Amino acid sequence: REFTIDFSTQQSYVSSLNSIRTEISTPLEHISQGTTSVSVINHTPPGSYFAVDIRGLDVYQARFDHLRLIIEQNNLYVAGFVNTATNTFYRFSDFTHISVPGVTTVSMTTDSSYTTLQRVAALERSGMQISRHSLVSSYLALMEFSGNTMTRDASRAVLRFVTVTAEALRFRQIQREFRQALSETAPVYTMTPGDVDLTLNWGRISNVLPEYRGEDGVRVGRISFNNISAILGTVAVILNCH
């Protein structure tokens, strides 16, 4: 299926992510307050993916609308990016099993891992800045990209777009921190060490939270949740650890 993430306003961005969560995941009964829950990704057949259309990068104009992300559904990994103006899917080497019809598929030599992307980007995520400006610049870098080997500018662009799509889908904390950048005052989101820690421990968190049954706290390595409110403010979507 296809979903839009609309960066026009804070409200459109949050609503976009929540629509995706509601369609691809199921709330945990023991970590759910009102309409907010930690949800578990629904099991789909291996190879399943969904498309994300990027919209609203320019608030007042309908432009910058040719970027699509391909996301593996069972784990929210970004398999690559599509230029819909050239009809070209740039696919990371580690996603050979993701087959997208109708597009030209460019099998890149570059793998998707954060270690690889940060090396090619010459950019560390801890301290990485993301503003509306840098998402526009990231968009333009991806639309200008060609060939089968990632460049420094395309890698920086992927690091930023993965943070505000797939990682924000996983972590309400990143969603809430980044969305400030979409307001009219246009502040800068700076990724924190804690943000990075969350993204590198998603599997560990996903293995623990399904066991929660109303205990006073949860401890996963250096991560501590001391009440339900803390969990809900941090984690939105977890893997399905059957």
């Binding site: 949050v14 907010t36 309400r172 969603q175 809430r176 403010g233």
Partner: peptide, 6 residues
Amino acid sequence: GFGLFD
């Protein structure tokens, strides 16, 4: 209207 956590 972001509720308590969004």
